[PDB]
Every structure is written in C-alpha cells, then in structure tokens.
Design a protein around this ligand. Structure first.
Ligand SMILES: Nc1ncnc2c1ncn2[C@@H]1O[C@H](COP(=O)(O)OP(=O)(O)O)[C@@H](O)[C@H]1O
Ligand SMILES: Nc1ncnc2c1ncn2[C@@H]1O[C@H](COP(=O)(O)OP(=O)(O)O)[C@@H](O)[C@H]1O
Lengths: 14, 254, 257, 14
C-alpha cells in the first residue's frame, strides 16, 4: 500500500 | 469578465486539456470566451484546439504592436462563441503588455478569459495568474503534482495582483485530474480525499483517466466535444459548477 | 565524464522518472553517477529518489557559495555509486548562471564522476536551456502524443543552435529518443502514434522505449526509482536503455503486444 | 483511427 506512504511523505513537506 | 487561470506548477497534469475543454464548454453555454496560451516558445493550445494551421499572429505579436487583437484571435470554427489567442514562439510577456491585452478583451465583451498557464513558477506562469480572479489548480493524485500545486497556492496568495493589493483574494478551485477510483481502492493512488486534506481548497471537478483524451488531441478536438467520453462529461460538470450550478461528482467511485 | 541532459520541452512526459531510473541503473553498473535537478523553484527529483528529507543545501546554494558541493550532494543510501544534487527553491530566474553551472560541472568531473545526468525542467526558457547547454548527449523524452512530439522537435532545434557545442562548431550533442509511456495495444487499435510514426517525425536514434506501467506510480509513491522494481516492465526497459548507453546492443522489448 | 490524423497534422508542422 504505497498510497499511504505517499500521503505521509507529502504532509511532512507541505 | 471572469479571468480564470488554469495553473499547476507540475508539468503535464492536464492544464491544456482542461483549458481547452473548459473554454469550449463555456462557449457552448453561450458565454463568449477566449482561451489564451501563456507559454513562452512552445505552442500547445493551438494543437489541442485543432487550429495549429490558422495561427498567423500570436500573443507576443499583439503585445509588441505587430498585430491587433483582431488579427491574432482565431475564431473557433466548430463551436460558436469561442476564440483562441495562441502563444508566441520566441525564446517578451510584460505585465503592462498583458494588462493592455486583457482590457481590450473585456472591451470586446468577453465574459470569460481562460488563461492556459505553462508549467513552473517563473515567468510565463506568474504572468498567467497575476491578473486572475480565479484559479483552477490542476492536480494529479501523484506526489510531485500535489507538492507543486501547494507551491503554486503560495504564489497565488502572495504574488498575484489581488494579493499584492489587499483586494479580495483569487478564488481557488481544485481540478483533480487523471483520477482512477480502482487504483485508489487497491491502495495504489492517493484518493480525492487525501488530496483535499493536503491542498485545502474547494473541489470544482474530477476528471477520470480516459483513453478518449489521447484520441481527442490526436484530432485537435477538445475532449468535451466527445459526448461518450467520461472525461468529457466530467468537464461539462465542471463548467456547470463554474457557472454556479451544483452537480454531483461522478467517476469518483468504481 | 559524459554529461547527459534528459530533456523534452513538453511537461510531464517522464524526464524525472527517466533521469532517476537511468542514473540509478548507471550507478548499479558501477559507474559513479550524479543526477542534478535543474528545476527553478520546484523540487521533484528529491521526491522521486526518496531523499526529500535529507536535502539541506541545493544547486543554487552551491553556485552562490553558501555551501560546498560536498555539503549539497546527497549520497543515495540504497544504491552504491549514486549521488543527487537537488534543485533550488527560489523563484529567481537569474539564480542559475552559465558561469555558475560550469564551475559546478568542473568540480564534479574533478570528483571523478563518470556520468553527470542533468534532469531538465519543461520549457525552453532558463532552467531547460541551462541543463542542455553543457551536454555531450541529450535524451529527448517523448510520449506518443501530439503536444509532446511537437515540443520535442522544438527542443531539437535548440540543441542544435543554443548548446555550447553548437555555438562553437564542436562535435554536435549526440541525440537519442527515449519514447515513453508507450502502449502497443493502443497503437494497433489505431489510437496512438506508433514508435515508427514518432521516428519518421523526430529523426533520431532510438535509445529506449518505456511501456506505460502501473509500477511507475507505485515507485514515486515510495520514493524508489522504478528500475529498482525487478518485476516492473518499465524498470526492465530502463535497464535496457542503460545497457544501450554503455554501448551494448539490446533488442527492443515491449513494442509488440 | 485518430493515430493517422495525428501523424498527418504533425508532419505539416515539423
Ligand atoms: N483524463 C486524462 N486521461 C488520460 N490522459 C490524460 C488525461 N488528461 C491529460 N492526459 C494526458 O496527459 C498528458 C498531459 O496533458 P496536457 O493537457 O498536455 O498537460 P499540461 O497542459 O499540464 O502540460 C497528455 O499526454 C494527455 O493525453
Ligand atoms: N512509463 C510510465 N508508465 C506510467 N506512468 C508514467 C510512466 N512514466 C511517467 N509516468 C507518469 O507520468 C507523469 C509525469 O512524469 P515525470 O517523470 O514527473 O515527468 P517530467 O519529470 O517529465 O515532468 C507522472 O505522473 C508519472 O507517474
């Protein structure tokens, strides 16, 4: 489930 | 006149597809609309609108007084009410210049001026949003695109003419594009909701991944004209919402 | 050192995916490689390489003397021999200077890099011009789509007239076509330009063909270049491309259905 | 068959 990894990595940056 | 910039930061998310489909949809609804290609040195809007060969003068020609707005505007042949101002092909776009063009277009009684922005946050993209009253932030459920849309929201809030003058801020809308509900439920793709929780703005449309979009650009015919295409129908919904009508979001569940 | 620009003109064709997969593949083959993000204000290479959180200094920091090449280079953790120079995050178009970029590229040659992969942004304006200017080779990245083929042609015109090699009558930039997001099934139903249609228009040597692959979205989700996924067709086609860049012939897979 | 239309439109421009 890579959608969840994508979402966490995204929040940290934005 | 509503000046609507179609923007994104990220390259290749559907700005041109969306600018063309939406400009057409608005024209269909009887609203006199012009869609302007703000790209610097690459002509892609004329290719998608199918008028690549009628292009005599362009946006920069009009700004440098080598041509009138009437000489550079191309009236669409297929849809009444629709006009295209195509992009320059030099490697030019001044703030004063672009402002003068936009005022001339308001004076010609255009209701909707759709600004088809290029990628990035440098010159052409800044120029396309600067005078906007609304922005359609075009985004894929992908990590680069969500990150670059967030950066573009920062610029819309600080570098636009409305922000730099404490006017009413640019009205922002999220156009989630190339969505795939099946991919979302197998856990392979950010969902519509994941993307809203991050870029916290109002949803104005969701365009499904559709094999009709490749076929539409191949012919130079905007995808809203293909009445069997799911992408076309979702763009017609979007146009309704821009005109103030609620419409339920289709193509978000499988 | 071979300086290879990954370019395109059209946005969103696969430059980042390709720059990442190819830099990784070259590293895997034991060639010391750096991949540099030439974007102005948008950091996407670090996100695809999976090192978005180790980014302390960037390309423009090094050019303005706020950091050394050593401070800004990020050594990949997963693949030996691989380094990443990430993009600046200022809106300033000036920032990337010709003298500045040249100085960085010489430092990198001096650090013994065999391959300097330049991940170009879209467009033909500043960041893109800077990425191809010092190139010895160009991978023109293209989709079987009308906008992309038109914009690749424009980029060929720039490679041939605005690069340092062209402006000095040197041996011209060696050009290769990386046809990306190909779909043989779509081609045969008559919905998609074929590989051959694209070659007859942009008349350059084919160096790879990357199939449309659901593995590419999963790869960027994790921050893991797609060549590292040994089951992905796009990964295999990128490993073929790397072989061809190193001089080995390989038959073209994923062009028939 | 829109790949053929694409091809012709392309050749005229390039
Ligand atoms: N809904 C969609 N389904 C499938 N492909 C799409 C969709 N929208 C856009 N595309 C494809 O994505 C690519 C980018 O579209 P384009 O409008 O040219 O991007 P941009 O204007 O942001 O550079 C094109 O190759 C187009 O065919
Ligand atoms: N071979 C492929 N199969 C499926 N999707 C791809 C492939 N290559 C790229 N993509 C997708 O296309 C989009 C553009 O890719 P990217 O490498 O970011 O473009 P660029 O770096 O050229 O601006 C991304 O959403 C990516 O996931």
């Amino acid at each position: 489930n890579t959608a969840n990894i994508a979402k966490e990595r995204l929040q940290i940056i934005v | 006149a509503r000046i609507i910039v179609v923007t994104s930061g990220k390259g290749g998310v559907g700005k041109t597809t969306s600018s063309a489909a939406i400009a057409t949809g608005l024209a269909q609804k009887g609203k006199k609309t012009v869609v302007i290609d703000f790209a610097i040195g690459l002509r892609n809007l004329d290719l998608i609108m199918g008028c690549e060969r009628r292009v005599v003068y362009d946006f920069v020609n009009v700004i440098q007084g080598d041509a009138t707005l009437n000489q550079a505007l191309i009236k669409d042949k297929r849809t009444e009410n629709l006009y295209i101002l195509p992009a320059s092909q030099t490697r030019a776009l001044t703030r004063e210049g672009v402002a003068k063009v936009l005022d001339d277009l308001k004076a010609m009684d255009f209701e909707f001026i759709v600004c088809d922005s290029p990628a990035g946050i440098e010159t052409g993209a800044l120029m396309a949003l600067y005078f906007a009253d609304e922005a359609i932030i075009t985004t894929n459920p992908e990590v680069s695109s969500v990150r670059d849309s967030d950066r573009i929201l920062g610029i819309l809030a600080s570098k636009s003419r409305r922000a730099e003058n404490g006017e009413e801020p640019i009205k922002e809308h999220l156009l989630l594009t190339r969505y795939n509900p099946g991919r979302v439920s197998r856990g392979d793709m950010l969902s519509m909701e994941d993307v809203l929780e991050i870029l916290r703005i109002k949803l104005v449309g969701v365009i499904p991944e559709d094999q009709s979009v490749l076929r539409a650009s191949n012919q130079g015919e905007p995808v809203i004209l293909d009445i069997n295409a799911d992408a076309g129908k979702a763009y017609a919904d979007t146009v309704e919402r821009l005109l103030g009508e609620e419409r339920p979001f289709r193509f978000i569940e499988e």
